[PDB]
Design a protein around this ligand. Structure first.
Ligand SMILES: [Zn+2]
Ligand SMILES: [Zn+2]
Lengths: 49, 46, 178, 88, 98, 361
């Protein structure tokens, strides 16, 4: 388009929330920056007593 | 005639009997509990 | 029975096959009331004060007329246009006269609570207040489209004869009342 | 969820629907046994009217359990949610 | 929450498009607010942890930024643009319990 | 049927771990043992959409994939649960079949995506102003409407009406009146529920008084909010203007807001005339601000009494002594020609013909 656009029409919301929420729940923190793939970094709190 | 539920905090009787959203009529709360059964049950004192 | 109010026609649409070739530029040049503007559209428009109507002429040998209050008046206006065209030197003829559309309106003189009508007739009564104040209702017997307003007036369109407008009004009236 | 279907002979629900209330869900304080149903759920075969097929939430286990409370809530996606707390 | 978000944002405060330059985009500040839940008609209310436990929801708070960007003019600023949602550790500074 | 007895009393039953079907009439097994998947392959399970399994999804035109991606991104930038996204994409895919829609210009497709997400959100009763969605699309409002009606007519799908209550609920929360921000004096902070209830009852009053049908709801709602806020403390808010109000709230007031407010004030005086104390006090448009709660307390009986004196568009409430007069009958069309000098009057002389030729040289 010749008329100028605004980035306001492309402020995505899901990617951050997904990228965080799933990262905590599944317990893997894959990161391309360091080529780091860490596992078992989260656990379910044990409510035996 | 309809089934009567109990709200979260106010515990004022609420009724749905439809596909309406689960929301208390007085407060904005959205949790409910079924009332205790009408029938009797029989227990052993052991 | 009626409320004593009869629907009133406001516009009539009719067309004819002239049956001969015509030149838009020649008609525009030789006619006082002709308007021609090919840069926008390749047709010649026509106006007469009696019957009060607007018409268009096309080089293919076609005419359309509108603005009359009755189908006989539209036919009279169209024949006047054909007379003008013939006296302009074109061997036009009045072939295949037809009526296309006519618009009527009426009133019931009481307020219309449109929400009830849309809640009882949503299938056909399209209501939307935001963009357009009036309610839109399409009904089948005959194939007419209706516009309805809170003041009690109604506009009817899509008919060929006044009997259709009357029949549609009489059918809708009980729905309007309740 | 459909209510417990009632036996035409004895005029009471069939054994497998013994504990269900009038709205098709258990009643707090009642005793459930093995192979009874807790929620008479049926879902439509869409996968002219779409037929439903039943998929009850049956109770398994080697011992009877007592129901303590039963809650209901709706998520934002208008999905109804039921949770039951069973006791021994 | 209190410093490292600010540090990251300052570390990537500005961006621009190579095509048709003189068009830019700058961040100014960033915040994390308080926990809440989305009501189904675009309103929100604060929620305690236990409600979230029962409803199987997630306990989180919104992330908001104030933005500067150009479109024909450069005088276009928003003050409370949300970007996402942050899980909240219980009893931390922003948790309802503290 | 039982092969041993021919009956149909077969009941599927399970022993401690043996699933089986037994003729309960005579006790004769007829089908026992089953085969099932395992948890070891459960984590290995995958999925292929049936359309991709049937070979579809390769026909998606670049513009079709662009449009569906637009549906997704539009849906997601409003934090909607994914159900809306998938329903809207299904609706857009359903639309794309008609040749007359795939054949269209770009802005047509954009507005199609807009109206599609609009109809889906309406289906779920979710309130949303068409203005905001028009704001989030490049196209213009008029073309938006034109295509909206085109598509609803083409598909004839249900159009649930826009409920006023839910719209009040959404729009009220938008304000910043309810927090002690530095930019606003604390004088103008209240209880959210009290404000909501005042505005809710005012809006229903406006509705029942025929103030809402066939018009924009946003200005009347804005007016009601302003008057409710003023009424919650008439001591000082009576000195504040609606223009000042929208400045404080950062809200774009509709142009007809003042007119809607004036209409509601006229209705307010018509209501105030009913009550004994109010009618004795001889109130006015301004001073009445401090009795709105009292009026609302007894709304129903007083308004029913007042109706016996209705509301209609004030423009046509000017006491029209004549309504739809019957025009004279002029259906006669003559015999063949009533006149002939008309053609002479409608044709140019050679002088004017040359004049027309030289007109646009
Ligand atoms: Zn409650
Ligand atoms: Zn047998």
């Amino acid at each position: 388009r010749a008329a100028q656009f605004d980035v306001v029409k492309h402020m995505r919301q899901d990617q951050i929330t997904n990228g965080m929420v799933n990262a905590i729940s599944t317990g893997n923190w894959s990161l391309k920056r360091f080529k780091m793939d860490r596992q078992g970094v989260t656990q379910v709190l044990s409510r035996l007593s | 005639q309809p089934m009567i539920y109990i709200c979260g905090e106010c515990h004022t009787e609420n009724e749905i009997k439809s596909r309406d959203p689960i929301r208390c009529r007085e407060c904005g709360y959205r949790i409910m509990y079924k009332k205790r059964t009408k029938r009797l049950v029989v227990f052993d004192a052991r | 029975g009626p409320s004593g109010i009869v629907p009133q026609l406001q516009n009539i649409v009719s067309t004819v096959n002239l049956g001969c070739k015509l030149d838009l530029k020649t008609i525009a040049l030789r006619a006082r009331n002709a308007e021609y503007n090919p840069k926008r559209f390749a047709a010649v428009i026509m106006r007469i004060r009696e019957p009060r109507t607007t018409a268009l002429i096309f080089s293919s040998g076609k005419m359309v007329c509108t603005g009359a209050k009755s189908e006989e008046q539209s036919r009279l206006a169209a024949r006047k246009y054909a007379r003008v065209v013939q006296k302009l030197g074109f061997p036009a003829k009045f072939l295949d006269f037809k009526i296309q559309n006519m618009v009527g309106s009426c009133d019931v003189k009481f307020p219309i609570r449109l929400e009830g009508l849309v809640l009882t007739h949503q299938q056909f009564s399209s209501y939307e207040p935001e963009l357009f104040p009036g309610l839109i209702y399409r009904m089948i017997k005959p194939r007419i489209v209706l516009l309805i307003f809170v003041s009690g007036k109604v506009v009817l369109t899509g008919a060929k004869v006044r009997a259709e407008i009357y029949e549609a009004f009489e059918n809708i009236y009980p729905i309007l009342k309740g | 969820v459909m209510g417990p279907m009632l036996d035409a002979a004895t005029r009471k629900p069939i054994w497998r629907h013994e504990i269900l209330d009038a709205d098709g869900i258990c009643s707090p304080g009642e005793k459930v046994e093995n192979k009874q149903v807790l929620v008479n759920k049926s879902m439509p075969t869409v996968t002219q009217q779409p037929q439903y097929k039943d998929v009850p939430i049956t109770y398994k286990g080697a011992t009877d359990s007592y129901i303590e409370k039963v809650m209901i809530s709706s998520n934002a996606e208008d999905a109804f949610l039921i949770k039951m707390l069973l006791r021994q | 929450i209190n410093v490292e978000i600010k540090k990251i944002m300052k570390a990537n405060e500005k961006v621009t498009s190579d095509a048709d330059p003189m068009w830019y985009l700058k961040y100014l500040n960033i915040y994390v607010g308080l926990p809440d839940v989305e009501e189904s008609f675009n309103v929100t209310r604060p929620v305690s942890p236990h409600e979230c436990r029962l409803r199987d929801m997630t306990y989180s708070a919104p992330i908001t930024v104030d933005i500067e960007y150009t479109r024909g003019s450069q005088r276009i600023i928003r003050n409370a643009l949300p970007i996402g949602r942050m899980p909240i550790m219980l009893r931390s500074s922003n948790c309802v319990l503290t | 049927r039982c092969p041993d007895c021919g009956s149909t009393e077969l009941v599927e039953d399970s022993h401690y771990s043996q699933s089986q079907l037994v003729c309960s009439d005579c006790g004769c097994v007829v089908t026992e043992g089953v085969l099932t998947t395992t948890f070891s392959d459960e984590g290995n399970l995958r999925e292929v959409t049936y359309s991709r399994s049937t070979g579809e999804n390769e026909q998606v035109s670049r513009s079709q994939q662009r449009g569906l991606r637009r549906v997704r991104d539009l849906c997601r930038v409003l934090q909607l649960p994914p159900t809306f996204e998938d329903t809207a994409v299904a609706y857009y895919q359903q639309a794309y079949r008609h040749s007359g829609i795939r054949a269209a210009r770009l802005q047509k497709k954009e507005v199609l995506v807009g109206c599609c997400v609009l109809i889906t959100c309406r289906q779920h009763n979710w309130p949303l102003t068409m203005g905001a969605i028009c704001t989030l699309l490049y196209a213009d409002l008029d073309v938006f409407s034109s295509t909206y009606m085109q598509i609803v007519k083409l598909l004839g799908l249900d159009v649930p009406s826009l409920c006023l209550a839910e719209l009040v609920k959404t729009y009220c929360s938008s304000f910043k009146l309810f927090q002690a921000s530095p930019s606003v004096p604390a004088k103008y902070v209240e209880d959210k529920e009290k404000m909501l209830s005042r505005t809710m009852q005012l809006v229903e009053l406006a509705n029942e008084t025929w103030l809402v049908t066939g018009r924009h709801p946003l200005p009347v709602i804005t007016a009601a909010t302003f008057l409710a806020w003023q009424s919650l403390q008439p001591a000082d808010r009576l000195s504040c203007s609606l223009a000042r109000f929208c400045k404080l709230a950062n809200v774009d007031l509709p142009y007809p807001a003042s007119s809607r407010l004036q209409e509601l004030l006229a209705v307010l005086l018509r209501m105030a005339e009913q009550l004994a104390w109010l009618r004795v006090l001889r109130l006015d448009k301004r001073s009445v601000v401090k009795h709105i709660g009292d009026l609302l307390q007894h709304r129903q009986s007083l308004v029913r009494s007042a109706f016996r004196d209705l509301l209609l568009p004030p423009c046509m409430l000017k006491s029209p002594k004549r309504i739809c007069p019957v025009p004279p009958v002029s259906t006669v069309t003559g015999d063949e020609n009533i006149s002939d000098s008309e053609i002479e009057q409608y044709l140019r002389t050679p002088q004017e013909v040359r004049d027309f030729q030289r007109a646009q040289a």
